[PDB]
Nucleic acid binder design. Structure first.
Ligand SMILES: [Zn+2]
Ligand SMILES: [Zn+2]
Ligand SMILES: [Zn+2]
Ligand SMILES: [Zn+2]
Lengths: 82, 98, 95, 113, 73, 72, 99, 80, 112, 96
DNA sequence: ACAGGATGTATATATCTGACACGTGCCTGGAGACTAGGGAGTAATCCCCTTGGCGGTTAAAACGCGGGGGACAGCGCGTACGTGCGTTTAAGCGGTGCTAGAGCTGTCTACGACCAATTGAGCGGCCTCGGCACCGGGATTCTCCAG
DNA sequence: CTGGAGAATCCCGGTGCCGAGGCCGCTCAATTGGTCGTAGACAGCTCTAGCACCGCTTAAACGCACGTACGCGCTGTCCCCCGCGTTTTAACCGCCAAGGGGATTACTCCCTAGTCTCCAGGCACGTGTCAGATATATACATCCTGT
């Protein structure tokens, strides 16, 4: 099975909630599409690094270790997963 | 007689309730599907641990919240209370993402 | 056989009970703590390795760790960490 | 002769809760240097234990005022973000399930006419 | 009939040398100032983006702005 | 009506490979200041008459600024 | 009569072009060296500096201030301003992560 | 050495802004720029002096400066 | 006593960059307790390719500046005019390289 | 007082420059820039490969760790071109 | 929108001048050749645990609408900053001179690796009870319209 | 300028639940005690360059005059986003179920550390010489006033 246009799954209320946690009062209507774009770019970078780490390990499953290494790679060190 | 709050007050209430809370603000299945779509764009026939998807969601939510904080600061800098795509672009380029 | 993994969980819990006798901790918080300890250990050890390489030293001593702590940790935290490390090294030297 | 001491951990020699032996082993197997001094694991374990004690004290303080006797990642996040010095130590680090520090820009508050 | 065939043949010959050898799909509008040969702008832009800084036919090395768009018409 | 486009197609292509001024020979020269294409002997003779300006866009150029090209 | 006077901004644009085309140091060497020694004596008294160390510090500070002024100008343009104000530098530094 | 931050003169800061593509500069820019420059020098010089102190040296070499810059994610080329 | 005279591993792989020096630095840099035979070859190839790319771009900039000698300004222009090579060295500053010449469109004269 | 011995990539950078730009020289400052760049990229690839070997509990760094490190650190098409060049050099080295 | 006057900038030749490119002598760091032992590649197994489906349901998303409050264009002003000019300051360049400390070298000794025996710390599994989530209701507090 | 009505939130308390923490068993890695090698501390010497001062020149900083353009406040207007009710929908939980491959073990082999000798690749030094600033002399691209 293949997956398409799941970037729309990051919905408008979800982006509004994320902005609320970021202390944003008013949100323009064009914020959402740019948020999909930038989140997609960030996910492409992180997932590409994680997939490269998985490919090096001869593995066909992306573990939390690969994601943690990809995050500590990009100056985005993540705690609580190993 | 219907009761309505003036615009911004409910938004401030959501700001307070989502800054007090810590749970993920994105639905889990759509984000998992997006991650799997990007992964199969990179490498086909791929499997994900649940902890890996949860870590990716934590990282993406943290990144988006920080980006929205910087975007809000950009909005205040331009004497505005609403954020615009130019605010996001300016924040990203100052952070070095562009 | 059976998988074996090591962590700073018991050490962090002992430190917590030393600093907060009647306070608990969760599994997720303990994971945060272990990740923090490994991250800081990696930073300090890598910096000490870099000092050893720059100064052509083949060994990592307490001087390298002290310099790494002064370089990485900020300000008053670095000063307290340096004092604690010197105290522990002097105590270990006697015993 | 066989008359020897039973055991005396280097952590107890240095008066540390953190393991001097495990830190020394990780230093040896981490390929940091060809050699590791005797006092280097002691110093590193002392520094790690001090940092752990500081963040755990702050986290317990954050948990106490929340009527919770059990530290959660939210308490750790609050402890790190309130302490600007630990915050700058861990500026580029994100904590899972920790949320964010509650703050709102002063201009976003209601005018209150 | 013969005149139409000759005209179609020479039109095909015109199509041969008016189209970029690298692409052979659409018309030339650029020149490299190193090998003095005419190509199309986005083919050489792709080659520079593909980090292939050699001319498709003479393999002459060209820079970032050694190619510029040609105003044929 | 297919042939009506044919000589219309001829005059369109035949116009744009020939010199804008001489209008009788294929272009084989360029001017890099104005990013325009002329033929070789026209720019030679119009340089020899000591007027260093582009006939159509009025761009000044030097001796080394224009050169031979292989349009084909 | 009528002495020549460039309009406000065109001279500034000419300096922008000149200092973006050129590569030399924009701060006089002796005052910056004195500033470096002033800041360094607060960490270790009786300290000596290699000359190349001072040049490296000067290059680093030139690059940092040029990038900071780039971000400052972008912040000013974002606020629909062509002049740079201190709040522009504060916003740029806080987004970059120093503040 | 006292009050050498004013040695970073106003025209020097204007030149720095010109290289940064700044067309107009406020009069309050210069003091705040001097302050942030002082902060940057404090960080870099503190790291460099720590590197020098570890080497048991009393001279701050250029290699100490480039190590200090590389520590702060500001890698500099041309000095080793 | 019969043996082959000499053949550097850089010459074996057709590389200008030193495979032997890269191998020695890999062992001496405390990266792993063992280093494979092909790892310095591949690393020398990658370093040589990056060197060739940056040097070709710098030489192109130098020719465009009518100079036959590469200066740090040409290297800086080579880095900043190539997006991939720019973001490979995004957090890297080059001494005496200057900056990429650009002016924001709002700062240009209004032509009024 | 004797004379020391300092290693550098200066002659290698010069050889590469001569094989890519036969009639173009390089200044001493630009040579220093190039040597610093080579050292930085070398240490970066080596550190990433060391971390890769540590993650997989592998005691040796082979061509595959450098493969992964180049695919990670180098961006865009630099990555795939350096992969092609490295694989070409490894094949030519194993053949001879 | 268009002269033109002036200002600044881009090309075309002599001329020095250190810096750069090439030639030499070492010498020590890579290359050849060979050993040996451990790291890892490969085959096999097994058991987590990941993926996929089905069903309930229900919280959340999507939709549409009213309106109000913020975004933005325009205007006015006044002051802060740009540009130019005369004046003063100190940066820069060179030259000398002194020596402090970088850098290197020879001793040797005292730490760090290595290794055999071992044992006590630390991890995996079990289990229990209590900290906490949740439900539910009242009291408190915030917001907003209408006086 | 508040009263009061409506709605969100805090607090108090009972109850169940699931995971935090204590305990037990085991096992393997940290400890102890030696040997042996060599890394570095330590004194001594050399000599490079860092520092300090001096004087002349002139580039640059600085102070001021004056104009202007733009930063900012105010006004209008207007339209886009927020609050909210309703409908849809698919997220989420539970349960089931298969099998994929992560992880572990065992075996073998080949690849790399280690050694020894050897030689030539590269570095330090020296020296010719030539892009290359650095001028002038001449020919266009803007800037600004003016009509
Ligand atoms: Zn083409
Ligand atoms: Zn060609
Ligand atoms: Zn013609
Ligand atoms: Zn023209």
């Amino acid at each position: 099975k293949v997956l398409r246009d799941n970037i729309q799954g990051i919905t408008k209320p979800a982006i509004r909630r994320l902005a609320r946690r970021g202390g944003v009062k008013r949100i323009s209507g064009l914020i959402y599409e740019e948020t999909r774009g930038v989140l997609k770019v960030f996910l492409e970078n992180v997932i590409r690094d994680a997939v490269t780490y998985t490919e090096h390990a001869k593995r066909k499953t992306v573990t939390a270790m690969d994601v943690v290494y990809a995050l500590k790679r990009q100056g985005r060190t993540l705690y609580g997963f190993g | 007689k219907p009761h309505r709050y003036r615009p911004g007050t409910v938004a401030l209430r959501e700001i307070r309730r989502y800054q007090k809370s810590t749970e993920l603000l994105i639905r889990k299945l759509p984000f998992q599907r997006l991650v799997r779509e990007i992964a199969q764009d990179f490498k086909t026939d791929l499997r994900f641990q649940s902890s890996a998807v949860m870590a990716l969601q934590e990282a993406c939510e943290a990144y988006l919240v920080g980006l929205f904080e910087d975007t809000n600061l950009c909005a205040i800098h331009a004497k505005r209370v609403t954020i615009m795509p130019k605010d996001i672009q300016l924040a990203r380029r100052i952070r070095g993402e562009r | 056989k059976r998988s074996r993994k090591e962590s700073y969980s018991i050490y962090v819990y002992k430190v917590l009970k030393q600093v907060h006798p009647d306070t608990g901790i969760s599994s997720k918080a303990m994971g945060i703590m272990n990740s923090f300890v490994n991250d800081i250990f990696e930073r300090i050890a890598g910096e000490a390795s870099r000092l050893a390489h720059y100064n052509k030293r083949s060994t990592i001593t307490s001087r390298e760790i002290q310099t790494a702590v002064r370089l990485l940790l900020p300000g008053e935290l670095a000063k307290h960490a340096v004092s604690e490390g010197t105290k522990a090294v002097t105590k270990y030297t006697s015993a | 002769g066989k008359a020897r001491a039973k055991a005396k951990t280097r952590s107890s020699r240095a008066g540390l809760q953190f393991p001097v032996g495990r830190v020394h082993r990780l230093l040896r197997k981490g390929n940091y240097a060809e050699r590791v001094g005797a006092g280097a694991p002691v110093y590193l374990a002392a520094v790690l234990e001090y940092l752990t004690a500081e963040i755990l004290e702050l986290a317990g303080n954050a948990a106490r005022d929340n009527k919770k006797t059990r530290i959660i990642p939210r308490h750790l996040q609050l402890a790190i973000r309130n302490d600007e010095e630990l915050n700058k130590l861990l500026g580029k680090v994100t904590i899972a399930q920790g949320g964010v520090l509650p703050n709102i820009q002063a201009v976003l508050l209601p005018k209150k006419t | 009939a013969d005149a139409d065939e000759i005209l179609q043949e020479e039109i095909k010959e015109y199509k041969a040398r008016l189209t970029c050898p690298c692409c052979n799909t659409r018309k030339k509008d650029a020149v490299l100032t190193k090998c003095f040969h005419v190509f199309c702008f986005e083919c050489v832009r792709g080659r520079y983006e593909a980090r292939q800084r050699k001319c498709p036919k003479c393999n002459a090395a060209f820079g970032a702005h050694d190619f510029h768009r040609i105003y044929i018409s």
